Design a protein around this ligand. Structure first.
Ligand SMILES: Nc1ncnc2c1ncn2[C@@H]1O[C@H](COP(=O)(O)OP(=O)(O)OP(=O)(O)O)[C@@H](O)[C@H]1O
Ligand SMILES: [Mg+2]
Length: 437
RNA sequence: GGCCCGGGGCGGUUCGAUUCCGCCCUGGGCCACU
């Protein structure tokens, strides 16, 4: 097991077989014919146009070029009209920039409308750079497409591929830029081992400098950070994965990790061993796009975690899961039950004005003096994390994300114990607690 | 939708709040959906 031989075997996993390629070329030819029959102006971009698409994950991107004077509404209406007329079956679901997704002779297709600008200067639609990325890449990625595939396969197998909010990882484009910059997958991995959270990679200048945060400047637009949505943690996982890989090569790094089935009876025993409070807030999943949902699940989950820490329940970690039916914010605290009494800091004995106001307070236990200042015993309105969250969630629902919050407002429940291990969250909990196997 | 920076109004908590928990108005960037 040496890098050399391993990467040789890995190609079998990332390179599309001749049949899959034929399927794409055949689908390409059909798109062309449907589009030419409409006399539409288009251009093939992305993975398929450059032959850097990962085996099994083929998607053809067709970009409909529109004059700059056109309305964003005209693009949407016209582009959606063209997309629907050109796909066997289609689906329209997006967060902001419109596009049609569908199928042609068996392969996934994305028909997207954009403005045909000159200079990726001041983009008008969110996707106007894409055509220029193609221009900039077609002449430089030639001969190294399999190197790109190795990188994509590597990141995909380890859950950090996509740049969408569900993953906060490396986009396909970023991968190609990295390949152009380092020359190959091995080189990229070798150098990535020394990346820092301040690393700046400028491919157009062929330079690596120190910066404010992780920044990969787009050759097409120097102000654009291609890795803007790559989370710090995901950057850290990659760098580490790169160290581990070079240290002990294995094509296991290209094989998707074990689905993991682990029985609920085992989870119960682990939680018992841990002596922690493991619970979850359950509510109905809002009918909105992944790209809108996840950031809200992140916020809600975080706002509640902070409530748990300032409330002294010693939160350990939080996680979340979304099924098609419901959503779950998961928590584990070191404190299952806290006392009713606690001490609140008061003024220094020195100024009677404030000491006076501090003592006029109707109180159950009579404040005391300790180290030069007054302190008072106070009673909590709740003593467990669950009682706390039920309280917080019912009252601060509006701060847990627009849609996620509104849903919790109309309904939510706190699941714990055995009734929790039944829900579709065992995987997430095991992951959250670091259960190995 | 989420994040970041900023205006102007407020409610609650607190001995004490610009500073802690939040709500309305609003201006400007950015990110995801290709
Ligand atoms: N998040 C993004 N950041 C930058 N460019 C992007 C992003 N998403 C899409 N693009 C542009 O649109 C093109 C199409 O992206 P798409 O989502 O189809 O993935 P891809 O790049 O085709 O690779 P793959 O299909 O193998 O994931 C990219 O090649 C790039 O030019
Ligand atoms: Mg594609």
């Amino acid at each position: 097991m040496k890098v050399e031989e391993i990467l040789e075997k890995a190609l079998e996993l990332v390179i599309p077989d001749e049949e899959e390629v034929r399927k794409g070329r055949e689908a390409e030819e059909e798109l062309r014919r449907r589009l030419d029959e409409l006399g539409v102006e288009y251009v093939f971009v992305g993975s398929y146009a450059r032959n850097t698409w990962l085996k099994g994950s083929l998607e053809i991107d067709v970009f409909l070029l529109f004059p700059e004077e056109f309305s964003k509404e005209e693009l949407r209406e016209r582009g959606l009209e063209i997309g629907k007329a050109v796909l066997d079956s289609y689906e329209i679901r997006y967060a902001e920039h419109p596009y049609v997704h569908g199928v042609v002779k068996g392969v996934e297709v994305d028909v997207v409308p954009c403005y045909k600008l000159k200079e990726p200067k001041n983009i008008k639609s969110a996707v106007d750079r894409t055509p220029f990325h193609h221009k900039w890449l077609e002449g430089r990625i030639k001969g190294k497409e399999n190197e790109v595939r190795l990188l994509k396969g590597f990141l995909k197998a380890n859950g950090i591929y996509g740049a969408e909010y569900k993953v906060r990882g490396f986009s396909g484009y970023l991968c190609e830029l990295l390949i152009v910059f380092y020359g190959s997958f091995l080189e990229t991995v070798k150098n990535a081992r020394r990346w820092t959270r301040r690393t700046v990679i400028d491919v157009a200048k062929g330079e690596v400098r120190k910066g404010e945060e992780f920044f990969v400047v787009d050759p097409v637009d120097e102000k654009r950070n291609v890795a803007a949505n790559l989370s710090l943690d995901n950057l850290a996982r990659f760098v580490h994965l790169c160290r581990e890989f070079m240290e002990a090569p294995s094509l296991g790094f290209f094989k998707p990790k074990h689905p993991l089935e682990i029985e609920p009876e085992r989870l119960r025993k682990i939680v018992e061993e841990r002596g922690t409070a493991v619970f979850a807030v359950k509510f109905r999943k809002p009918d909105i796009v992944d790209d809108n949902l996840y950031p809200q699940l992140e916020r809600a989950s975080r706002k509640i975690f902070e409530f748990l820490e300032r409330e002294n329940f010693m939160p350990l970690r939080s996680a979340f899961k979304a099924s098609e039916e419901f959503c779950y914010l998961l928590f584990e605290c070191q404190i299952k039950e806290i006392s009713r009494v606690f001490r609140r800091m008061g003024p220094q004995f020195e100024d009677e004005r404030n000491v006076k106001k501090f003592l006029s307070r109707n109180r159950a236990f009579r404040p005391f003096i300790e180290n030069g200042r007054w302190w008072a015993f106070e009673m909590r309105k709740f003593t467990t994390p669950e009682e706390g969250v039920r309280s917080y969630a019912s009252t601060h629902w509006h701060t847990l994300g627009k849609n996620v919050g509104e849903s919790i407002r109309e309904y939510f429940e706190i699941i714990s114990g055995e009734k929790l291990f039944k829900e579709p969250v065992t995987a997430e909990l095991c992951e959250m607690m670091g259960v190995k196997d």
